[PDB]
């Protein structure tokens, strides 16, 4: 009985108060920590760098003047969402930029971290490797192995609707003609 008290007691008793705004900085830094550093070095090497804003992502100097049309975004689960409500947007151009809205709940919950990591993966596939065309036959080979496999819901997990309708096996030409879908997967 005395044993159990210790774990619950520790989880509940915050000895000292970090502060009102420190928590935000510590949360974001911990989040970016989990991604392999080498990705960050590749990102810096190709130019623009991630900056964490605090307010409504819809209104920031870097993004207000560019890409006004793309107000419609789709989260990782495929559901639509408007940019103002969304808590993270990224943009591909001469200045690759990634903007993240500060919040205190990235360590505690997980659904928000998934969207952030999804955007880092999108920057990695579309902006870094694309300069070297790194996704290629090995990736195509695994990809192709997923479509044709015993009742593997894996497709449902990684393929969009457009892919579930290519009747035959994947071809090296298709990636060339269509390169947004594969980069998404």
């Amino acid at each position: 009985q005395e044993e159990h008290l210790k774990e619950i007691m520790k989880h509940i008793v915050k000895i000292e108060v970090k502060g009102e705004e420190a928590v935000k900085k510590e949360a974001a830094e911990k989040l970016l920590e989990k991604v392999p550093s080498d990705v960050l070095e590749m990102y810096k090497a190709i130019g623009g760098k991630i900056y964490i804003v605090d307010g409504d992502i819809t209104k920031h100097i870097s993004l207000e003047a560019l890409s006004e049309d793309k107000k419609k975004i789709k989260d990782i689960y495929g559901k639509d969402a408007l940019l103002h409500e969304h808590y993270v947007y990224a943009k591909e151009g001469y200045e690759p930029v990634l903007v993240i809205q500060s919040s205190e709940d990235y360590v505690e919950n997980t659904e928000k971290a998934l969207n952030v990591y999804y955007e880092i993966g999108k920057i990695l596939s579309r902006d870094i490797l694309s300069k070297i065309n790194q996704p290629y036959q090995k990736f195509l080979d695994v990809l192709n192995t997923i479509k044709n496999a015993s009742d593997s819901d894996g497709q449902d997990l990684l393929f969009t609707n457009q892919l579930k309708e290519h009747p035959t096996d994947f071809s090296v030409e298709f990636l060339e003609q269509n390169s947004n879908e594969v980069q998404e997967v």
Binding site: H11, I12, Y77, K79, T110, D153, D156
Partner: protein, 527 residues
Amino acid sequence: VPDRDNDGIPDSLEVEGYTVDVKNKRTFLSPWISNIHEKKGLTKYKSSPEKWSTASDPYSDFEKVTGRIDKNVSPEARHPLVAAYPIVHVDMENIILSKNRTISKNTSTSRTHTSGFSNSNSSTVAIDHSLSLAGERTWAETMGLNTADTARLNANIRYVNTGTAPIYNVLPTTSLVLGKNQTLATIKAKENQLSQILAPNNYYPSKNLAPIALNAQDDFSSTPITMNYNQFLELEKTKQLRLDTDQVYGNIATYNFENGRVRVDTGSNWSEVLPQIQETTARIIFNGKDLNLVERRIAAVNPSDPLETTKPDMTLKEALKIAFGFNEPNGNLQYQGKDITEFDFNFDQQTSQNIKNQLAELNATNIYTVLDKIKLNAKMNILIRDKRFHYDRNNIAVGADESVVKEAHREVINSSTEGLLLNIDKDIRKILSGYIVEIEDTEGLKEVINDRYDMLNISSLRQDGKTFIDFKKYNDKLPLYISNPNYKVNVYAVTKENTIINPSENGDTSTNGIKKILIFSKKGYEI
């Protein structure tokens, strides 16, 4: 991965939504993915990261959803936010009377609920009034009862479990009461005899066995249910009894992880759990399924208590979805077709106040629209009853608007001179006490065949669910005569609410002053 409540599921999963899903032969717990779990018909669970059992009943959040649990807990209570507990009431099927020449009548019982309504089960029997014997007018004389005599009471009862979890050892004590406070008898708590199980929606003893005889037939009391004359008089005037039962159930059956054995632990006892459930959940009463009062409890948040604010917010619509079976074929709430709009919402005064507030900060007047935006707090009591029927003081279905009654009869499968064989929706035939048959002369006369208040029970039910009305039953065992192939044959139905149960002031037995609704009127040639 942290897990403070120590219930198997990690924190983030419990707070955000999770689901268990069997991957070929092994079951593992996974975070809810919107697209891959939804097409598979899996339910999105939520729970409290700081409660070993969010509902507060004796089964852990993990056990409920994984199935490691007493296989008797009803399916709908497998969901972590629906409290699983027993609800036992007593149903008396028929009685018999004599003097310390035996009046043996069949009774019908219904679980009741009346009005500031509180958490204690009671039922209510109604004794059949129709005259099984022709010559048995006035009970006071059919039994040679004198001013200084005493009658003997001998009834048959069974226990019904309409809750969601099984009871094991004990069986509840329950006291019969006539009138307001005249306690005729308290049914003993038989000892070491309920070694069987009462699973939800079951009877004890089962439908296959003789029902438990109330009088012992031994020497415990010569006539335990004695009853002076005056009681018998009140009973004759009212024809109804009450059965109040308390909540002293047995112990609890728990699941053992070491070997998967389900053993009844003698330490845990339902009389310690029920108060918790009763003080931290919202209560919903529904009479939709078969016109019986089904009570469910859903775990709702209580602002005043830290530990209690942890439970996931419950919107009324979601409560109905997971507790009873309402669904959305086209996004419109309905229970096997009947849209949510055919039901009334009644609330206790506290809850009423709270909901008026909720309707004010949303600027809405029709609850049926903003339904998915109403927050449930702890301790609300909500009563959802079908809007189409009239109801009495004890919230039992008792009558209805005439128009519904007529449409329910417009399908004449067959008609002859011996009676009708209809096919009516099983729910309506629970508010019709009987039928008045009459014949109409081509010039407006009126001849009522069964022209006695206690001669209405002429409608039986065939083994294929077709109702058949027999004229020869309370006739002279003779077929139906018609004085003119142009004479109309009229049939009236009498709903329960509008019935008479005793002879009038001057002992009138004719069906004159009874409000009768027309159900049939065909030509003599047509019959």
